[PDB]
């Protein structure tokens, strides 16, 4: 058969404001992201990437259809974000990733390697993947 592996990295970077913002008490900017391990445009084969935030964010289900696949925000607390990658091929199962936002103990980075495996995809999707 044919196996196409698309290595990815996902997670988040964060920077402390310097002080706490008295307006809303946010302390950090963060960017949560998926990206290919090596430089490529994933919109070749990816329809969209949802980033599900804590539901006390406005518009908690964020959608990104064009690289970079990232959401930038501010806050004061760490919680799980769900990252769901949908493919242009409707017969390819979405990939669900789970990421604990890291804010605390210099840029803070929490990023994970993973691999989207396409086992025997349609020739058409194979064309999109390569
Ligand atoms: C509207 C708004 O700013 N919501 C918001 C902001 C920050 C945070 C949360 C929600 C909940 C999780 C922790 C956190 O840092």
CA separation for the pair 45, 64 (Å, rounded): 14
75: exposed, middle or buried (Cβ count in 10 Å: 0-12, 13-18, 19+): buried
Task: Tell whether ligand 1 has an atom less than 6 A from the beta carbon of residue 29.
Answer: no
Per the DSSP assignment, residues forming a β-bridge with 63 are 50
Would you state the structure tokens that stand for residue 106, as one six-digit string?
A: 């210099």
Listed in sequence order, the DSSP H helices in the chain are: 123-129
Q: Which residues of 30-55 are buried (b: 16+ CB within 10 A; e: fewer)?
A: bebbbbbeeeeebbebbebbbbbbee
Q: Residue 14 in 3-state DSSP?
A: strand
* Residue 98, domain extent: 1-130
Ligand 1 contact, 23 CB (< 6 A): no
Look at the chain and report how many structural domains it folds into: 1
Compute the distance between CA of residue 30 and CA of residue 110 in angstroms, rounded to an integer.
Answer: 11
Q: 126 by DSSP, 3-state: which?
A: helix
Cβ(78) – ligand 1 distance below 6 Å: no
How many A from CA of 118 to the centre of ligand 1?
36
Q: From which experimental method does this structure derive?
A: X-ray
Give the whole-angstrom CA distance, residue 69 versus residue 67: 5
Pocket perturbation via mutation, ligand 1, pick of 53, 56, 62, 100 by most ligand atoms within 8 A of CB = 56
* Beta carbons of 21 and 129 less than 8 angstroms apart: no
> From atom 3 of ligand 1, which residue's Cα is the shortest distance away?
57
Q: What is the largest CA-CA distance in the chain?
A: 59
């Amino acid at each position: 058969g044919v196996t196409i592996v698309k290595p990815i990295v996902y997670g988040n970077v964060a920077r402390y404001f310097g002080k706490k913002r008295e307006e809303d008490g946010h302390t950090h900017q963060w960017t949560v992201y998926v990206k290919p391990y090596r430089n490529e445009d994933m919109s070749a084969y990816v329809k969209k990437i949802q980033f599900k935030l804590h539901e006390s964010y406005g518009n908690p289900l964020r959608v990104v259809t064009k690289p970079p696949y990232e959401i930038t925000e501010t806050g004061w607390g760490e919680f799980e974000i769900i990252i769901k990658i949908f493919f242009i091929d409707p017969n390819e199962r979405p990939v669900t990733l789970y990421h604990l936002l890291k804010l605390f103990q210099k840029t803070v980075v929490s990023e994970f390697y993973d691999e989207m495996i396409f086992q025997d995809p349609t020739a058409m999707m194979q064309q999109l993947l390569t």
